[PDB]
Design a binder for these strands. Structure first.
Ligand SMILES: [Mg+2]
Ligand SMILES: [Mg+2]
Ligand SMILES: [Mg+2]
Ligand SMILES: [Mg+2]
Ligand SMILES: [Mg+2]
Ligand SMILES: [Mg+2]
Ligand SMILES: [Mg+2]
Ligand SMILES: [Mg+2]
Ligand SMILES: [Mg+2]
Ligand SMILES: [Mg+2]
Ligand SMILES: [Mg+2]
Ligand SMILES: [Mg+2]
Ligand SMILES: [Mg+2]
Ligand SMILES: [Mg+2]
Ligand SMILES: [Mg+2]
Ligand SMILES: [Mg+2]
Ligand SMILES: [Mg+2]
Lengths: 61, 86, 80, 82, 205
RNA sequence: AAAUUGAAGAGUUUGAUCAUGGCUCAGAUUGAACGCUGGCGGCAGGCCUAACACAUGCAAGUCGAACGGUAACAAGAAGAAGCUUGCUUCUUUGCUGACGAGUGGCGGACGGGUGAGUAAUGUCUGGGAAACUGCCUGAUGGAGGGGGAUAACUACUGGAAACGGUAGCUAAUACCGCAUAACGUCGCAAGACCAAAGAGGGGGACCUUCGGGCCUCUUGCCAUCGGAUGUGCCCAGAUGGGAUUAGCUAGUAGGUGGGGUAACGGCUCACCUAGGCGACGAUCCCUAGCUGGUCUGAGAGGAUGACCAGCCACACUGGAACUGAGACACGGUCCAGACUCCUACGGGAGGCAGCAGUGGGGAAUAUUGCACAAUGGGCGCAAGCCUGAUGCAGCCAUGCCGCGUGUAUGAAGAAGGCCUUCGGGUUGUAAAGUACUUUCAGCGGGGAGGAAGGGAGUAAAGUUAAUACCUUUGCUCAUUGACGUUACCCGCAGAAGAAGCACCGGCUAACUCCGUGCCAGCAGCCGCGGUAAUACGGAGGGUGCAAGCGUUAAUCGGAAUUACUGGGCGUAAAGCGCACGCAGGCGGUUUGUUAAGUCAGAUGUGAAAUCCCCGGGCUCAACCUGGGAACUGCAUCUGAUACUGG
């Protein structure tokens, strides 16, 4: 299938292990899934301090 | 084969199987004699075969291997065949 | 005193047996509709005397060959 | 054989043994024929710990039922008390 | 399991006094309870039916000292109990040990009554109870342990509680600082400004 | 004194309206996973995927009061060794406690695990006859007398091992005859047939070949009639979808005769009649363990079968049989196929979908823990042994509930931050400071309860020739705990050791600034980003929940959007183009008969568990528990004919 990458900035490329999660994008014909961040390889968004649960961002010190 | 009790009960099961097979073969031969005499003509031979087989089947029934219902069903059917036969 | 049923015989082309078609009234669990349901049974009647068209009365008993576990008790309304 | 014994239907650290007439081949807390009273080794005073029905217990034990070791002791205690 | 923040932002957001202070001073002289807290408290928008129901529920919860889970459990208990749902909910909320201690006057606020309950200071019928949600049955005797009978806080709370209207369903005697729980309070005994229809409708939604 | 407390809509087509109609949202729930965070305790849950294979340890043993015997076990008891006047020895188990191996009974069919297969041979509900049933219990009688083998062992002996052969051995509640019997069997009767086993505790008189007779007791063994339980069989009603699955069945329908299981049975063969099933769904295809129950819903309904309980089916796969009352048997047997592992190449060993754990798969499943102390189970007269059942211990916020992470204050509305109409407001009584408390955690102590029984002793009764011996009844003493650093309580000292998550345009509870500039981006729908969009990211502030917060996965409500409750067809989708007509559905009016449908009462049952009502116990709730109600269903019996039907 084809999924969508959220947030701003990612480190995904060919031969990368991701965690597909169920959710469609209305303005993208064909996309039916997302990649949940904080998984095996798709790290969290950089420089984000709000709604970190949905983007896999650690609690700042 | 992993339990000593299992081994020693399998050995006894075989030692009982041989004896039970011997006894059942003897019983079947004695019963088959009655049918052979019934199909062989004279009713006297059938009556003698039944009277000789009777102390065997009942004793076996009262000693394990076979059952009293089995003995009754054999004896009643044989008696009915013999008496009704000419 | 003992349970018994009554039905209509539909076929008797067998030795010492008949085929009965009992009709029952039930209410539909969902729509509450009263429809007629059929419960056909294989009934054995020794000394065959019942034809096709009349109603018969049967009683439950032990199975006889494979699927007839019913006997004929009385013959009511034998008129064709 | 048919015996009258105890089945634990309590919780963690809270035993509660109902007296049931269950076959010896069945499980301790599984199948049973009838239930005859209960016993609570943790219940303090003012609470009715035991309610075994002596009439039905005797009626069952007459027909070859076996009374367990602790059940017999509880019955003896109940009879001595009242 | 309790609110650990300021006790007056909730009151000023609700719009009235929730009795979350002692009462030595005045609420108006101690805080600024006329608008909501924050940068846009002065701006007053229009609230819908859901908004007013939620505001009433939050006011009741802040007055009594319970969370959403416990409040919903109490609502379910009131619904399953035969009678008026709002009256049953109010009675169940009032039956809490901390609330009856506050009514007796052994604590300045409910947050102090429950603290005394939890700190092995309340001795009900000779048995210590540390639960702020402990239901009080009729004809129950609530007392204070020896190690807390001679405290300054209890005496100050008792002498301050004389200002408020004493409840008519308790028979607390201050000679031994012990109270007896009478017939359960009713809708007329409690305040009539609490709209229980909004409460019973919000959870029905 | 009750099982009665029951129904919410919103956004979106259009310049604007009405109606239809599709999508989405607010809500609740689960065996859950992910991101962030994370304190304690109580109660539960923890391979949904690979019924994919297993290194390793333990899960079914038992009793000498059945027996020969006793090479390890204690006294070398006893005799007695070449006695050290106590160092030991060829002996001694027809002297003892006790059992290495063995015969012999019971249990292995219970307990434990998993849903592959199975849409009916299974399951639930209600009946029925044609049966079996060890251990349990009641009743009636016997329990007389012999025979020959064998395990152990012994001399070997085949083979690397697993195992096996020869000959002599012999004791059994081992095996088999003989004598006896019906309230048993067979037989219309007359008549024929059917088995047994004995052990232990003592003891007067009389004995005795001094082995042991003689007397009671305890217990065990046969035959038969009963009870309870379990099992086997049949019948009636329900048990997913598909007709783009319209014929299926030659042991198949039935009958006659024989043989076979515990019995009825094409269960099976040998002959006869061609029937049986099917538009009330036969046959075929896919999927699926069933039920009490569970979640949603006011109800009706929909989905579903986590834990537990009852039933079913399966033990690497397929086939089969034996012992055994009870199996075609998870750790019993044989063979075939695969895998793994030794071999001296002739040859041999194994099945963790048991309890822990390993490898593999997956988003995801926990220790190679203690104890039989309590409940049972198995064996044993009893002590006594085993139990990875069970009772507990450890980890996981996976689920529910409780508690705490302070508190009265405390105005210079401290300071700082935020924006600011730069006069002020927000954070904010918030913070600092002061008084107060020490729940929970740490330390030092006390400390119930789950434990009931059992053995050693003393008496009375029941026996008995007999206080011997045994049972019962009591009696005081010496006794038994994994949990256990037990629950719980007491004193220490200090506010410490403890709050995070999501949202803020409408649905929906909550608005202001800064940064890009249809770019970054948000998104469940309406839709936003083209110099400020309260809609993106950052900040302030607020909102909601709380050791949890959001997303994802799945079901239902709303959806009256499959409408039986509870919808429409002139135009939004919907009258066949029309007519005839089978099955089927309905049916004018009066009376008589019956009582099938209907109604009222009663009985059996609808397991237990679960929901609800009334109460009780853990400090309280979660949790457990007693009674009641309920299980809206089925069968039977008794009365009514107003209505439908005959
Ligand atoms: Mg996590
Ligand atoms: Mg001999
Ligand atoms: Mg044939
Ligand atoms: Mg619906
Ligand atoms: Mg396997
Ligand atoms: Mg089987
Ligand atoms: Mg395992
Ligand atoms: Mg035990
Ligand atoms: Mg300032
Ligand atoms: Mg919004
Ligand atoms: Mg419509
Ligand atoms: Mg049109
Ligand atoms: Mg049209
Ligand atoms: Mg027309
Ligand atoms: Mg209570
Ligand atoms: Mg029930
Ligand atoms: Mg009529």
């Amino acid at each position: 299938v084809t999924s969508y990458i959220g947030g701003e900035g990612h480190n995904l490329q060919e031969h990368s292990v991701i965690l597909i999660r169920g959710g469609r994008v209305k303005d993208l014909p064909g996309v039916r899934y997302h990649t949940v961040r904080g998984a095996l390889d798709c790290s969290g968004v950089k420089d984000r301090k709000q709604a970190r649960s949905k983007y896999g961002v650690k609690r700042p010190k | 084969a992993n339990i000593k009790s299992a081994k020693k009960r399998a050995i006894q099961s075989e030692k009982a199987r041989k004896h039970n097979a011997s006894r059942r073969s003897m019983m079947r031969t004695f019963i088959k004699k009655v049918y052979a005499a019934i199909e062989a003509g004279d009713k006297a031979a059938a009556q003698k075969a039944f009277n000789e087989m009777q102390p065997i089947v009942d004793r076996q029934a009262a000693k394990g291997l076979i059952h009293k219902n089995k003995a009754a069903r054999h004896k009643a059917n044989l008696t009915a065949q013999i008496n009704k036969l000419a | 005193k003992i349970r018994t049923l009554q039905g209509r015989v539909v076929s008797d082309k067998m030795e010492k047996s008949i085929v009965v078609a009992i009709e029952r009234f039930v209410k539909h669990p969902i729509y509450g509709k009263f429809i007629k349901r059929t419960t056909k049974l294989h009934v054995h009647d020794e000394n065959n005397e019942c034809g096709i068209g009349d109603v018969v009365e049967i009683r439950e008993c032990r199975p006889l060959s494979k699927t007839k576990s019913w006997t004929l008790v009385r013959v009511v309304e034998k008129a064709v | 054989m048919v015996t009258i014994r105890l089945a634990r239907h309590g919780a963690k650290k809270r035993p509660f043994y109902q007296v049931v007439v269950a076959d010896s081949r069945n499980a301790r807390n599984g199948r049973f024929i009838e239930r005859v009273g209960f016993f609570n080794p943790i219940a303090s005073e003012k609470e009715e710990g035991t309610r075994l029905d002596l009439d039905r217990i005797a009626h069952w034990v007459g027909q070859g039922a076996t009374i367990s070791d602790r059940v017999a002791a509880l019955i003896k205690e109940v009879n001595k008390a009242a | 399991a309790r609110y650990l923040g300021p006790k007056l932002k909730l009151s000023r957001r609700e719009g009235t006094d929730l009795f979350l202070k002692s009462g030595v001073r005045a609420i108006d002289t101690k805080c600024k309870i006329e608008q909501a807290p924050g940068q846009h408290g002065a701006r007053k928008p229009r609230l819908s039916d859901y908004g007013v129901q939620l505001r009433e529920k939050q006011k009741v919860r802040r007055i009594y000292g319970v969370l959403e889970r416990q409040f919903r459990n109490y609502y379910k208990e009131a619904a399953r109990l035969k009678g008026n749902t709002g009256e049953n909910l109010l009675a169940l909320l009032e039956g809490r040990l901390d609330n009856v201690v506050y009514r007796m006057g052994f604590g300045a606020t409910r947050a102090e009554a429950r603290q005394l309950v939890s700190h092995k200071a309340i001795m009900v019928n000779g048995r210590v109870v540390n639960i702020a949600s402990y239901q009080v049955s009729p004809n129950d005797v609530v007392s204070i342990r020896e190690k807390a009978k001679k405290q300054s806080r209890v005496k100050a709370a008792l002498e301050l509680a004389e200002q408020r209207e004493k409840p008519t369903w308790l028979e607390v005697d201050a000679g031994k600082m012990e109270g007896t729980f009478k017939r359960k309070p009713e809708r007329s005994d409690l305040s009539a400004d609490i709209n229980e229809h909004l409460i019973v409708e919000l959870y029905s939604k």
